[PDB]
Amino acid sequence: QQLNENKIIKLLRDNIPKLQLIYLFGNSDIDIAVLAADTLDNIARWELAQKLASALDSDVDLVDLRSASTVLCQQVVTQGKQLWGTQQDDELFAVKTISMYQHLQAERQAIIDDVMA
Amino acid sequence: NDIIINKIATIKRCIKRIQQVYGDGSQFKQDFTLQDSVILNLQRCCEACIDIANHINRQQQLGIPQSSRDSFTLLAQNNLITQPLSDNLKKMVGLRNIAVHDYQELNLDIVVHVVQHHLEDFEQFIDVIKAE
Amino acid sequence: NDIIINKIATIKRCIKRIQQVYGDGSQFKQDFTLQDSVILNLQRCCEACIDIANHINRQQQLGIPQSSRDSFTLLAQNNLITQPLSDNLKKMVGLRNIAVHDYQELNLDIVVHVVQHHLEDFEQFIDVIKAE
Amino acid sequence: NDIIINKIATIKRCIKRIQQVYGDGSQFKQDFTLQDSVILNLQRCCEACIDIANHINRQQQLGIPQSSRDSFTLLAQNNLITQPLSDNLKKMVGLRNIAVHDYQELNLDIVVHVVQHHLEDFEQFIDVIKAE
């Protein structure tokens, strides 16, 4: 398992320029999230996900924490293990996501109340 | 509906405030109070647009929003607003999140360009939603 | 903590901005621009306090709050800040929401009273978090 | 919980998509594109139901589901759903596998029967999970 983590870390670092954070969350797909100084190209992001999946012999979802939704970032913050990156960036991203998720929960409360009877 | 009317009036008032306070824009980079007023009224416009979009999504059960930007995506893929207008409103939502959540140094040139070229998007959104 | 340091610096700058723009308060209820500036800086103070509360809650593994007021509630339940300070900060959050989202008629007298008597709550929160 | 909300919203979206693309059914058995859309959205409904069932089995610690059908058996054993509803969801389980491949001559009648008689089962699962 730890050997699998190193493959993920090095594969992401060797293909993502100016990479800042690598989180691992989630026999099906391996759930990886990344934050860099830029937003990954959608097609290129999926291509890197498929490269990771072929290297690990298991499905892989690569989450761009710069373009992903607030709910997904909140899930990654709440359960994701940080594989790579400084703790300062981790704390910054965590507090950003928590504050934005609180404001969003304030925003979308009526819709959730309506759809859930 | 009445909530949509109130939020449309709020957007119009905030746009008038932005246009009145900005002036010719010479003293913007110099007066911090002017910048504060313009930023707050832009944020208010974004909040009112988000509230309108969320009320419409709740009225028609278009789904739940995954983010503040998503509140307009759920409109775009329902053929209620055009993709360029949706993308511009999502740009406004990104600016608003930058302003209030402070996860990046706020860029004043972006603010000037949005004031000069993106309030038209708020008025287009008013036009589109008014004929509900 | 560098994040706490930067957030405290933001709160201090915004407190100074509120105090300077308000001045003696003779033109406050007459000039909407000063009102907008003070509202925006109060929002900045509130958001920075909310971010600090969320950071401290995640750091000490006290729980991830669903609302911004729940973060101050957690800080109080864990005896990190006092209940009166927690209630004061949560009512400041309520004032910010009133002023920004406009779900009730904004009372400028409350903004004046907060400028006169309630910035000390931000100062006290800074001094309590500083001596962690 | 956000997972359950999103999965319920996805089931609702896919049921609306099925009901819209199918229409009255006069053009369905003639156009293969409508059949493809209906098959895909039915499989999406079934997969989302299985996901909700597995998440509830893991949440309330009802047991370790040996299969995707056993995930509904765990819900039925603890009287969270009725046995007829569990058996109908198990019916839907076989729908996704059968409709993957392109034996059109058999599955067409089966897909029509499912669209006519088994969307109420998805809605009923949505309703009974909603009460949690």
Side-chain angles (χ1 to χ4, degrees):
Chain A
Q1 182 270 353
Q2 313 274 279
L3 226 285
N4 281 322
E5 289 181 4
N6 288 317
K7 287 190 199 174
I8 305 167
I9 298 171
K10 274 66 176 187
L11 243 172
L12 292 169
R13 286 235 287 165
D14 296 359
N15 289 267
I16 299 177
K18 296 187 174 184
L19 176 62
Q20 300 180 4
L21 292 172
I22 300 180
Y23 293 99
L24 181 69
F25 67 118
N27 286 26
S28 180
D29 69 324
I30 299 176
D31 295 322
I32 316 164
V34 285
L35 170 62
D38 303 311
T39 70
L40 267 56
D41 172 65
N42 209 15
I43 298 180
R45 177 204 59 85
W46 180 85
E47 294 269 323
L48 179 55
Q50 305 312 131
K51 191 176 185 180
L52 284 164
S54 177
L56 302 172
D57 193 59
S58 182
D59 315 327
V60 163
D61 265 306
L62 194 59
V63 173
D64 184 16
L65 291 176
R66 245 175 177 262
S67 59
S69 70
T70 314
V71 183
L72 185 58
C73 296
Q74 179 66 23
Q75 202 102 16
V76 174
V77 165
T78 312
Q79 72 169 4
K81 171 202 292 184
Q82 181 189 19
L83 295 185
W84 187 83
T86 72
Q87 268 292 333
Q88 220 78 31
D89 294 355
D90 166 74
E91 296 171 355
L92 274 179
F93 173 74
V95 301
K96 150 198 158 56
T97 294
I98 291 174
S99 181
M100 295 190 70
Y101 186 75
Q102 292 169 357
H103 287 58
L104 176 65
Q105 284 286 343
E107 286 182 5
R108 63 173 190 170
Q109 189 61 68
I111 293 181
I112 297 184
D113 285 354
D114 170 66
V115 302
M116 303 294 297
Chain B
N1 204 271
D2 218 64
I3 311 173
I4 295 183
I5 295 172
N6 292 328
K7 292 298 184 179
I8 287 180
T10 294
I11 288 173
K12 304 291 271 299
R13 295 190 348 261
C14 297
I15 289 179
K16 255 197 303 300
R17 280 295 297 165
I18 290 175
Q19 297 166 346
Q20 166 192 356
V21 175
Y22 183 78
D24 52 67
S26 58
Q27 302 299 110
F28 183 83
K29 302 294 186 63
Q30 182 178 343
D31 191 2
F32 288 159
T33 305
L34 205 152
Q35 304 171 6
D36 293 338
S37 182
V38 170
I39 292 163
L40 179 61
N41 290 324
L42 273 178
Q43 175 190 349
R44 286 168 176 171
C45 282
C46 286
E47 299 283 1
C49 290
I50 289 159
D51 289 5
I52 291 180
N54 284 333
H55 174 70
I56 292 185
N57 295 332
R58 171 173 171 264
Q59 186 71 19
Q60 300 193 255
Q61 289 188 287
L62 308 181
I64 86 164
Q66 296 298 91
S67 69
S68 199
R69 297 163 296 173
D70 199 80
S71 182
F72 298 97
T73 300
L74 289 170
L75 297 183
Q77 55 193 13
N78 282 266
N79 297 274
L80 295 183
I81 62 176
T82 57
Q83 249 68 17
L85 180 66
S86 169
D87 297 356
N88 291 331
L89 295 174
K90 282 141 73 177
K91 299 175 179 183
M92 303 294 100
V93 173
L95 163 66
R96 187 215 67 168
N97 304 344
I98 293 281
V100 328
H101 285 98
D102 188 56
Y103 63 130
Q104 211 187 84
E105 164 154 341
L106 181 75
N107 187 285
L108 256 58
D109 309 324
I110 298 185
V111 175
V112 175
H113 202 267
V114 167
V115 169
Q116 292 181 348
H117 299 136
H118 283 266
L119 307 180
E120 160 197 358
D121 300 333
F122 292 141
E123 304 202 317
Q124 288 187 25
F125 189 63
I126 296 301
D127 266 353
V128 172
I129 301 304
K130 195 180 304 300
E132 53 189 352
Chain C
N1 195 274
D2 195 64
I3 297 185
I4 302 183
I5 283 177
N6 296 328
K7 287 296 183 177
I8 286 183
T10 304
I11 302 177
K12 299 265 261 301
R13 296 191 327 266
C14 292
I15 283 182
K16 254 182 287 297
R17 276 296 290 165
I18 297 169
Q19 295 174 343
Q20 178 184 352
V21 174
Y22 182 82
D24 49 56
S26 61
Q27 313 289 350
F28 189 83
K29 301 218 306 177
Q30 289 72 17
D31 191 5
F32 290 152
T33 310
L34 312 173
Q35 304 170 19
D36 295 324
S37 173
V38 174
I39 289 174
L40 184 71
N41 285 321
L42 286 163
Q43 170 197 270
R44 288 171 173 168
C45 286
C46 290
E47 290 288 349
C49 289
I50 289 165
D51 291 346
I52 292 180
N54 293 327
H55 176 253
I56 299 179
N57 286 322
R58 178 175 173 268
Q59 147 70 13
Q60 299 267 238
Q61 294 164 278
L62 313 175
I64 296 184
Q66 278 294 89
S67 79
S68 33
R69 298 178 177 90
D70 289 6
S71 46
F72 305 111
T73 299
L74 267 175
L75 293 183
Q77 291 171 340
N78 292 279
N79 303 274
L80 296 183
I81 62 178
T82 62
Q83 257 78 2
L85 175 57
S86 176
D87 293 354
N88 284 336
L89 296 175
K90 288 148 68 178
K91 290 165 187 174
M92 301 286 258
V93 172
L95 162 67
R96 171 219 167 260
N97 299 334
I98 292 277
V100 173
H101 295 96
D102 191 12
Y103 60 88
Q104 192 176 166
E105 233 278 1
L106 177 61
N107 206 331
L108 284 179
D109 296 335
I110 302 178
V111 181
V112 171
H113 196 273
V114 161
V115 171
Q116 288 176 333
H117 292 135
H118 281 280
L119 303 183
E120 190 170 349
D121 302 336
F122 294 140
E123 309 250 88
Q124 177 183 0
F125 179 71
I126 285 186
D127 288 334
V128 167
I129 301 310
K130 190 185 308 173
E132 54 200 0
Chain D
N1 191 282
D2 241 312
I3 301 177
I4 300 182
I5 300 176
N6 290 125
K7 295 292 185 179
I8 290 176
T10 300
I11 295 180
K12 300 278 276 300
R13 286 198 318 262
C14 296
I15 291 176
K16 277 188 286 294
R17 280 291 297 167
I18 291 161
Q19 295 176 354
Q20 178 179 343
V21 175
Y22 181 87
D24 48 58
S26 58
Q27 324 290 346
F28 179 81
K29 301 213 302 178
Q30 171 180 315
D31 186 10
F32 297 158
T33 303
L34 312 178
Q35 304 169 7
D36 293 326
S37 173
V38 158
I39 286 175
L40 184 60
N41 291 276
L42 279 170
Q43 185 196 235
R44 290 174 172 168
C45 282
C46 180
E47 192 85 319
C49 286
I50 300 175
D51 285 346
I52 298 182
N54 282 317
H55 176 261
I56 292 183
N57 291 324
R58 184 173 180 263
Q59 196 88 5
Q60 305 208 257
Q61 299 177 268
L62 306 179
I64 320 175
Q66 283 288 84
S67 64
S68 57
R69 287 181 168 89
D70 187 62
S71 188
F72 299 109
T73 305
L74 284 179
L75 295 182
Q77 285 173 345
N78 297 119
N79 297 274
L80 292 186
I81 54 177
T82 55
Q83 260 63 15
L85 189 59
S86 170
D87 299 332
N88 292 21
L89 301 173
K90 292 162 158 181
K91 274 184 201 129
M92 309 317 295
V93 164
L95 154 97
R96 63 105 192 275
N97 166 280
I98 254 261
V100 170
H101 311 14
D102 211 349
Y103 300 121
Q104 200 266 53
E105 206 177 35
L106 297 212
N107 304 332
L108 173 66
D109 302 321
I110 310 304
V111 167
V112 169
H113 183 259
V114 157
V115 173
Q116 287 182 344
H117 293 73
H118 285 275
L119 299 181
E120 305 87 319
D121 299 326
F122 293 145
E123 294 179 342
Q124 192 166 344
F125 186 67
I126 289 302
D127 294 358
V128 301
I129 299 315
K130 211 186 300 290
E132 294 293 333

